[PDB]
Amino acid sequence: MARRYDSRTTTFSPEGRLYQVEYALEAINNASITIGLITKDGVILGADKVFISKLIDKANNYEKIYKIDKHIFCGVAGLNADANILINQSRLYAQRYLYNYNEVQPVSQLVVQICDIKQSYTQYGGLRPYGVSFLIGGYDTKDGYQLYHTDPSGNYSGWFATAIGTNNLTASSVLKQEWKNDMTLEEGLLLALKTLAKSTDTEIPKSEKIELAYLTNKDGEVYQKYLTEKEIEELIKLYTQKY
Amino acid sequence: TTIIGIIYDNGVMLACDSRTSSGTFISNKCSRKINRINENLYVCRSGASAHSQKIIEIIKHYCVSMKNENRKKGRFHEGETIDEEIDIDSINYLDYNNLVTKNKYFYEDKFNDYNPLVENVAHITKKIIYTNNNFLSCALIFGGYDKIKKQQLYAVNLNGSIIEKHDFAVSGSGSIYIQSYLQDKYKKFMTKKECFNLILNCVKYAMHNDNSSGGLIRIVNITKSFVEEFTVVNTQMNFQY
Amino acid sequence: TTICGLVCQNAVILGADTRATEGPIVADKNCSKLHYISKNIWCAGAGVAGDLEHTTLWLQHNVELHRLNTNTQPRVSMCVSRLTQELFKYQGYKVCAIVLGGVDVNGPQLYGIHPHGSSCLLPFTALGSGSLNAMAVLEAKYRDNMTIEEGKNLVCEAICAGIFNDLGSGGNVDICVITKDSYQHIRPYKEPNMRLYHLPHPTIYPKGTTPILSEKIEYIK
Amino acid sequence: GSIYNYNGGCVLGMSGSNCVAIACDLRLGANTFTTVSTKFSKIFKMNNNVYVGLSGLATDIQTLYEILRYRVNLYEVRQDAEMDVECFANMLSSILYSNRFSPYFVNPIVVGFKLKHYKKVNYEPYLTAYDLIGAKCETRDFVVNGVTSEQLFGMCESLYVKDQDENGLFETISQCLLSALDRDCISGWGAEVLVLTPEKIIKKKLKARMD
Amino acid sequence: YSFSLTTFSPTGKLVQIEYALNRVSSSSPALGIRAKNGVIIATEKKSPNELIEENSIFKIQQISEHIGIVYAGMPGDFRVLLKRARKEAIRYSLQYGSEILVKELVKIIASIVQEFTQTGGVRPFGLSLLICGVDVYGYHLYQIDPSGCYFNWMATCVGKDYQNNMSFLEKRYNKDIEIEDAIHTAILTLKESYEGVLNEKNIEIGVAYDNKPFKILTQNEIKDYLIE
Amino acid sequence: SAGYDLSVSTFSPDGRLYQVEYIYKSINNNNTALCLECKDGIICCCINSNMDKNKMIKKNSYNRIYHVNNNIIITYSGFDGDARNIIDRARSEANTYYYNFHTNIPLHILVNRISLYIHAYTLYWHMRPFAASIIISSFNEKDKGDIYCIEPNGACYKYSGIVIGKNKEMFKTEIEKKDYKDINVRDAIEDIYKFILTSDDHMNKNNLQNLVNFSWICKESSYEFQNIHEEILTPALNKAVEYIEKL
Amino acid sequence: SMYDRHLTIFSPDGNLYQIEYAIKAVKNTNITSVGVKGENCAVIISQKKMATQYISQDKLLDYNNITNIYNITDEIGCSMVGMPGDCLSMVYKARSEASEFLYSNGYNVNAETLCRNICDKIQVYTQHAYMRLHACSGMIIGIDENNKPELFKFDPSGFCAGYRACVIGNKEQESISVLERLLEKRKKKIQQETIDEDIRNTTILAIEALQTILAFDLKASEIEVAIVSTKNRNFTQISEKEIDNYLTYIAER
């Protein structure tokens, strides 16, 4: 009887729910905050860095925002190992689309593929789901700048500005009351800093705990910039002057 | 190539030439065509070098497995406890000419408790060759000693058939030239010296008449308790007429 | 190709020419035909260059993995077994004739391996299209227990014979001396062929002599 | 092979002083003598310091380019760094040999810069040529490939000059390519020449014969 | 049949990974320090008895030239992962003609470790790995946890009393230390952790410095370093 | 016990396999099977006392003694299906050995291979271990006799006389009273009948002749497997019954 | 949970209790084996005793067949202690490993490599839940290519190590102390000895260690001694007559 040890992960509950997916969502909501927003100049992704020690190499070390392609990047909230697996898979998917069609994959299509992986895990087999949620931003010539949010169930939805992780309600309120349809890149970055500070329950953000990146489309090319400590510090000085 | 095996009164003697040629060019002057499978078991190879070598490697691996599984548990033979020499230097002496041409070693398994059987090794080789006779093309002569059938010769022929020889076995292109010579000169219960001279002369005649046979002559003498090996370099054939 | 090897006292000396040919045309004038398998094992290749390069790289990395796992010194016999089993598996369709030489616990060892998967332990050998000229030199001059310098001179003579008598051989002479504690790879060792006539001055085209249809300049950032 | 004669095509690569150059013919053929296109480029950019010239069967050229772009993009996104020219050359060799017994009918060259770090960075010209199963010839002056290989070899042996600036390098490579193409029935119909410098790339189309 | 033995709990945790971490934290201590021109990994290898052969136990191992690995946890898991890492390194070498990059190797091994927290019928690896290396991009020190997450460290310690060891190492670590200073600090940290008196027989050291092959220090060199 | 005895692939806190222990109980509760090495051969006997209440079974149709190569006796105590499976595997191994090497498989090699086959089923959490104890024996002039018993846990041991199943303690005690290395098989038949009558309380002079299987490998049978003929068994049965009735 | 001790999954403290239970199962066999290493020789001594189990020792049992010592190859030997089926399974696995190594690499595996490969196989049992642990602990002796004796020991947990002297048995720390005393006494001698004298002294040391550890007089028929050495690289058992000679010498000295 090996079945006594089975937990039956891919099984409905009396309320028509999946306990494993709910627990993965709890883990994601315990994870650190990751915000994203869309300006008229690009998609901004920010994240709060969880402190481990000051012996961590903080230079050239982005652990909550990753590049999936030249025109797609993502922010992670949940389990880093699961996120790494899914990110490698997404990179493979984007390169496979380019190989098949001689053109770059649309962001919606990539999101659909990775979410299909997640849904298949929740439905087939007897393995646990992925404890990771994604904020996938990108640009393509069909739908312009795009920002998507994906959860462990395989569900995904498009957003103009959103936040995931711990205390995402405060970030969502800040973004709801501040975000505007037409914003410049600098304005969006300042708003991202403000929402990160509010979620972290602080007034003056510290560049040692902030990851900032933005994906823009200029001069016919998509360019991703992952702000360094000094650039984030200049932004924080601007934010301090503003508020 | 010439490989021969002869059964004399007290053992089995294998002999071979040592020429490997790719057509008319001699790729290897002095190859080693008699190969040890076990301490009391040897094989002479003929045909494609790659085929025979790879087959013999597989068979050596199999024979290691068989010997390991043949070992029984405990201790044995506690109250029980288990001649003419060839003048190899005289045989090799040449007037116009740290050289080692003779070796001898005793069996570690004195009572043949776990040594595999000559028939077993020959038949596993035959099965391997027959399962791939669409590709493999080699002829082998297994010479060995085991406590059941004593000294034995088995011919594994091209296409993967096995025939046990009780007098002698020959193979290779050069054996054809000495077929009648060996048939005429062989007798039952030859002494060691008689068998050595006969087999050496057979290889010498085969090398004289066959372009694919040449180089030195390698001889292995397997007996109940030891194995001797000789190299002969005085291979030239001199006729009075 | 002319590759060769010989065993001298406490060392193995391999030599090779440096010409790769595509039909009657020299595709490479200074190709490297001596490959490092391990610190104490080297090989020389003849036949199809792609097969030789792939197989030698594979053998080198498998031998390094085996050395790391067993924490012992690599064995020429192990290299021979792996190579012959692979070549036999492919039935001579990987055209790789290899002179494999190395020094291990059993002392210096030289092997000739042929594309179908046969091997032979030799005191000296030669392979390639120049193999017959190299073999003539080696048969004429070889003796046991030669000094390393004498073996180097003999290998150079054999490779030069191949280079100057075979149309598929040319370039320089590369040598490798392998002992139990070090290897010396001399590339080139002889350099016997060089272009013999040169024009009084090189032909420099005046600027603007080539007509162009369009010119787009992009800056790399 | 005749399969190479089906389309034709030729690629050439040369090195100068702190610059390289890669040139190609622009024809696409059919049945060895019908010209269907005059803008079929055979030079592909892998990254800023790596270019590959692919000649041979056009379908195999496109397939190999797609595979190489896939591999390079994955490597670069994973490492967060541009792929080294030597690493790309070895990867191309291994990819070509992976189809050893049913190969791509393509004869490629790799032209680029090897970057060496000390502060500043040193750019070393890098040239390799291949046969269809990944046999690699690493060279310091010039590499050729295609049905015009003999003509290109002769022209480059006679006319190559070591350590030339970008202007002299362009003139030499273009002259070699044009003279070699003038003697080939199944190659030509325009020539494209790229000159790589550490700071810029110059792309030129040559006024060539179209017969 | 294969089902996940590591599953989410009502609070959203993977208790199996937590328990693997408990095993690691109970195991013996290891540390790594990135110097200005090199990286060292040290570990405390005590002798359970006078009959064992210290030269037979291998805690600091060489994955390839310029890449070494040490572990805290279960030796069988370590041996399996070390064989896998060597195979991955030679696979990269076969593909690209050059030695594997430390970041690439760490990512591959981390993914392998992750797979054992999700696949069916298996338990997670019970060890933490410290991988030190040198490549064209500099000197790298990475930690891999039983969950499959990897961390880029300037200096780190895993195993017993890793918190106290980390505090001690941080109080006297600066990025500009040399290889000699790093080795001295490593020995000091191991001595501070160890109860009793340390000796060259209780510790092992590996160094990758100045673009030289990874080296495992011998007992004599460790004794020379311990004289101070 | 305490939840540790529900699977064969879990050790208890005291390093025991309770599933294998339960298999041992099952085997000990089954019919009796003994093998005895004598001066000129080996005798194998099977007492099927469990069928003393099945009066409609065809006489002597139920046999628990088989042979492998016509010169190796193999009997069992346990489940008929499991034993049949193991005997089929033994025959398969003998066939493969002959195909490979053109000689009959040695008895110790066969015993080791069967032990490994049986032991393989005690390793996984989805297979049922074999509930059977196997006796494999042979005899020839040079080597005399070899008897091996394989337990359900895969342990093979060599004996000069073995009893498995019910009443095995009493059978062993009665067997050990004499040295059969210097007794012939024909004389040992009477002793075995006496042992059966004294030990098994479900056996009587009426059912001795239809609930007992008797085979041997001896000089009389040319060192090949034989079933002991009724012409040889009946006088011994009569003598044993007479003696036990006398006392 | 309810199965952290039933399966090879971590307990809250980080333990794998099934491995400890397998080690206890090995310990419960009450079979003792002692391996000693000399200058140019290695000896393994074991009891010709049946591992305690459900069945007992019968009067008609053939006691020569009882053995815990096996040949893995001609030149590599081992002593396996534990559940007899597991010991046979491990012996066959080691033999197949050695044969595969020989075929693949063209030369004979050494004891260290064989032990490490066996432990790599054991790790899979420790990590996968669907198979049982092999309750088998083994000693392996051989001679390496540099002509030094190698003695390695592996346990059910997949741990292997090389030893100057090792013991499998119920009591371990006292046995370790006994072996330490014997080895120190041997090292206290400063005169180099011949190969034969080294062989004799190593065998005597192993026999004396087993006698001291078992704390009762040993009969030559109840113990088995196997040796490997530079003089004879084949892993060979020594006869009961030789064992009795050694025992009489130990008693008389």
Ligand SMILES: */C(=C\S(C)(=O)=O)[C@H](Cc1c[nH]c2ccccc12)NC(=O)[C@H](CC(C)C)NC(=O)[C@H](Cc1c[nH]c2ccccc12)NC(=O)CN1CCOCC1
């Ligand atoms: C020796 C000559 S020989 C007559 O004895 O075969 C050399 C040995 C050699 C050459 N280069 C190396 C490198 C490493 C080790 C050994 C080496 N062999 C050859 O030169 C080959 C001889 C032919 C008859 C097989 N030539 C080749 O393999 C060609 C090399 C090549 C062609 N174009 C190139 C461009 C750049 C770099 C190299 C080359 N290749 C072919 O002939 C291609 N065919 C295609 C069909 O499949 C077989 C290979």
